[PDB]
């Protein structure tokens, strides 16, 4: 992981956001787009109402919040995390509504649209901003991901992770441990909403050029099982030609709803 942590030193938030959350990938008007698909996944899952609790931790958040727009309405205590201060500064820049904050409103609007509870998007961002108490550092490679004195309520009633594990591990085995490490932050019976890349080996972020470990849905399933989870749901989005730009070589996106037994 020496090489890994060494590559993310050049990782630029603004470029990453521009590469994955601005058009075309950041267009939500097209129903078949990858953004609507992800929001539908989270919305639908929480819509079952069978994923609930007090505290929630977002593993490997980076500069994005979209992954919590639906969840933020089922957990009062939300803990966001990331390995780079640079990302925690960008996140903060959005949370404290500072200047130069990324514009996630398209994603907020689409979440309100999908949930169908007549909620305006300003009110949703408001609620999300309120339930996010802290933004802490994390290293999914450490046996104890958050360290020791962490202000984060452990265990957590639920964990949310999108595009992290596979993007920070050099091999399957490394990805397999990384999963276990965060699985220690969840109480049994708890839930895991995991989103990740499929068969991707690299992606860019400004000056950074990161190496990803190419995982398949079958391997993701097998690792969840081989980690103490029951697969409640496992979905695959096959990346469409028009969303295959020069920013990476991702072939698809997966969503898994896993419960720690
Ligand atoms: C491709 S991004 C995912 C961003 C966001 N969660 C999303 O949905 O687009 C991977 C993130 O993992 C972070 N990261 C790097 N090394 C890490 C490590 N050792 N443990 C945990 N996260 C790490 C990076 O800083 C980056 O924000
Ligand atoms: O299609 N997308 O909306 C989307 C969003 C984020 C990311 C990807 C694709 C692929 N690369 C990952 C990092 O491994 C980050
Ligand atoms: O409860 N479900 O409706 C449901 C639907 C699909 C799947 C599961 C459960 C669990 N196994 C995965 C493997 O990819 C597929």
Cβ(222) – ligand 3 distance below 6 Å? no
Q: How was this structure determined?
A: X-ray
| Domain spans in the chain, listed from the N-terminal domain onward | 1-261
Write out the CATH class of domain 1-261: alpha beta
- Residue 82 marked ligand-binding: yes
129 lines ligand 3 (CB under 6 A): no
How many Cβ atoms sit within 10 Å of the Cβ of residue 233?
Answer: 14
Distance separating alpha carbons of residues 248 and 133, to the nearest angstrom? 33
Own/partner pairs for 97-102, CB < 8 Å, 24+ apart?
Answer: 97/129, 102/14, 102/17, 102/21, 102/63
Task: State the Cα–Cα distance between residues 164 and 169, nearest whole angstrom.
Answer: 9
Pocket flag, ligand 1, residue 157 (CB < 6 Å): no
Residues sharing a CB contact under 8 Å with residue 54, sequence separation 6 or more, in sequence order:
75, 76, 77, 153, 157
Spacing, Cα 84 to ligand 1 middle (Å): 8
Question: What spacing in Å lies between the alpha carbon of 118 and ligand 1's midpoint?
Answer: 33
Instruction: Look at phi and psi of residue 30 and say left if phi exceeds 0, alpha if psi is from -120 to 50, else beta.
Output: beta
For residues 160 and 132, give the distance between their C-alpha atoms in angstroms, rounded to a whole number: 13
Closest-CA residue to 40 (of 17, 9, 79, 70): 70
């Amino acid at each position: 992981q020496a090489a890994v942590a060494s590559a993310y030193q050049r990782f630029e938030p603004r470029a990453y956001l521009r590469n994955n959350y601005a058009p075309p990938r950041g267009d939500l008007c097209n129903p078949n787009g990858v953004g609507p698909w992800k929001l539908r996944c989270l919305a639908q899952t929480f819509a079952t109402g069978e994923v609930s609790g007090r505290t929630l931790i977002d593993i490997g958040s980076g500069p994005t919040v979209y992954q919590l727009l639906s969840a933020c309405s089922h957990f009062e205590d939300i803990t966001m995390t990331d390995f780079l201060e640079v990302n925690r500064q960008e996140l903060g820049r959005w949370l404290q509504e500072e200047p130069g904050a990324f514009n996630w409103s398209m994603y907020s609007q689409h979440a309100c649209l999908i949930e169908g509870k007549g909620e305006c998007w300003q009110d949703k961002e408001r609620q999300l901003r309120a339930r996010v108490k802290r933004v802490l550092p994390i290293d999914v490679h450490q046996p104890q991901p958050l360290g020791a004195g962490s202000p984060a309520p452990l265990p957590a009633d639920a964990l949310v992770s999108a595009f992290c594990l596979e993007a920070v591990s050099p091999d399957l085995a490394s990805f397999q441990r990384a999963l276990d490490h965060i699985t220690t932050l969840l109480r049994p019976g708890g839930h895991l909403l995991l989103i990740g890349a499929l068969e991707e080996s690299w992606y860019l972020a400004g000056e950074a050029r990161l190496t990803v470990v190419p995982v398949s849905e079958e391997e993701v399933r097998e690792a969840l099982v081989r980690s103490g989870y029951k697969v409640r749901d496992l979905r695959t989005y096959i990346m469409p030609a028009h969303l295959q730009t020069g920013v990476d070589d991702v072939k698809g996106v997966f969503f898994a709803w896993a419960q720690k037994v």
